C-alpha cells in the first residue's frame, strides 16, 4: 500500500529476476508494435509480462524492463506505482478481486465479500497462509449488468450468490479451474428471463445496403 521502496532481502536489485527466452521473443514482438524511436511505449506490456512470468514485481523486474527498453528506471517505477494491477508485493496464486462499486453494491456484493472472508478466514488485503488466495476489494471491473461479480487472475465470475463463490473457492482449493461465467442461468449479458430482443435470425450479407456501393 506504500509508494516508496525499502530493500527487503527478498525485494532488492540483487533479487534474481530474468526473462525466459520465449518471453524475450514475446518482448521483441511487443516492441515491434510501436514506431522506431518510441520504444518506451513498450513499458506497460513488457512489465505486465514480468507480472505474468513471476506473479509480482520485485525491483529487478522493474530494472530489467528499464534496461532492455533503454528507459530510466524511475520511468518504470512510475508506471509500476500508477497502475493498480502491478503487484509490488507477492500475492497468492489466486488473486480474488471483488468489485464493490455502486452497480455491484446495489446487488449485494457485501454478502459475497463477507462470504469470502468467513470462508478463507482472512480479510481484505490479507493472503491466506498457504499463499493460494489473496482477497482485495477493487473498483468497477466493467461487468455491471452481471453484478455481483469477482475477478480471479484472468476470469470474471458473475451473477454470484454466496453459495456460488463458496463453491468456486472449494474447487479452486481442489486444483481444478472453473468456468468464467454467470453462475445464474444466463450465458453472457441477456435478460435473465429470456430474450427481449435479437430473437429473429440475423439477416446476413447484402441486407439494407444502399445503392451506389
Amino acid at each position: 500500500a506504500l509508494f516508496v521502496h525499502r530493500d527487503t532481502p527478498k525485494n532488492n536489485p540483487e533479487t534474481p529476476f530474468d526473462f525466459t527466452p520465449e518471453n524475450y521473443k514475446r518482448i521483441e514482438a511487443i516492441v515491434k508494435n510501436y514506431p522506431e524511436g518510441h520504444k518506451a511505449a513498450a513499458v506497460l506490456p513488457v512489465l505486465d509480462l514480468a507480472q505474468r512470468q513471476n506473479g509480482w514485481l520485485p525491483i529487478s523486474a522493474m530494472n530489467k524492463v528499464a534496461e532492455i527498453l533503454q528507459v530510466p528506471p524511475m520511468r518504470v517505477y512510475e508506471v509500476a506505482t500508477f497502475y493498480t494491477m502491478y503487484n509490488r508485493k507477492p500475492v497468492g496464486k489466486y488473486h480474488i478481486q471483488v468489485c464493490t462499486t455502486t452497480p455491484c453494491m446495489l446487488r449485494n456484493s457485501d454478502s459475497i465479500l463477507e462470504a469470502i472472508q468467513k470462508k478463507l478466514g482472512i480479510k481484505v488485503g490479507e493472503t491466506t497462509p498457504d499463499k493460494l488466495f489473496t482477497l482485495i476489494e477493487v473498483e468497477c471491473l466493467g461487468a455491471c449488468v452481471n453484478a455481483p461479480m469477482v475477478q480471479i487472475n484472468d476470469n470474471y465470475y458473475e451473477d454470484l450468490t454466496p453459495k456460488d463463490i463458496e463453491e468456486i473457492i472449494d474447487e479452486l482449493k481442489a486444483g481444478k479451474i472453473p468456468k468464467p461465467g454467470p453462475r445464474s442461468g444466463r450465458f453472457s449479458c441477456e435478460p435473465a428471463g429470456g430474450l427481449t430482443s435479437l430473437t429473429e435470425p440475423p439477416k446476413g450479407p447484402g441486407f439494407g445496403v444502399q445503392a451506389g456501393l
Binding site: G37, A40, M74, R75
Partner: protein
C-alpha cells in the same frame, strides 16, 4: 516580480563587528541602511550627481521572451519530449 520594478540606490557596505558585551552587529556607518527608490535610472543618476555621490549603474536585466509550447512536450521526432508528466 513586483520587487524588480523600481530602481534602487544603495551604498557600499562598511564594517560590521561584534559587540563585546552582547555579540550584536555594531556599525559605524550612518549610510548602512540607506536604500533610496527611483522610478527611472536617470532620476537615480541625477540624485546621485546632485548629492556628490560617486555612483556606478548596473543596467536593468530583463528576462528575454521564451518560446513556450505545450504540445512540444509530446513531439514526434524532437528531443523535447518529456519522459514523464
Amino acid at each position: 516580480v513586483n520587487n524588480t520594478k523600481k530602481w534602487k540606490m544603495e551604498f557600499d557596505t562598511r564594517e560590521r563587528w561584534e559587540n563585546p558585551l552582547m555579540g550584536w552587529a555594531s556599525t559605524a556607518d550612518p549610510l548602512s541602511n540607506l536604500v533610496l527608490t527611483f522610478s527611472t535610472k536617470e532620476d537615480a543618476i541625477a540624485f546621485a550627481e546632485k548629492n556628490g555621490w560617486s555612483y556606478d549603474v548596473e543596467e536593468r536585466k530583463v528576462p528575454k521572451p521564451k518560446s513556450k509550447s505545450y504540445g512540444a512536450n509530446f513531439s514526434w521526432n524532437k528531443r523535447t519530449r518529456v519522459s514523464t508528466k
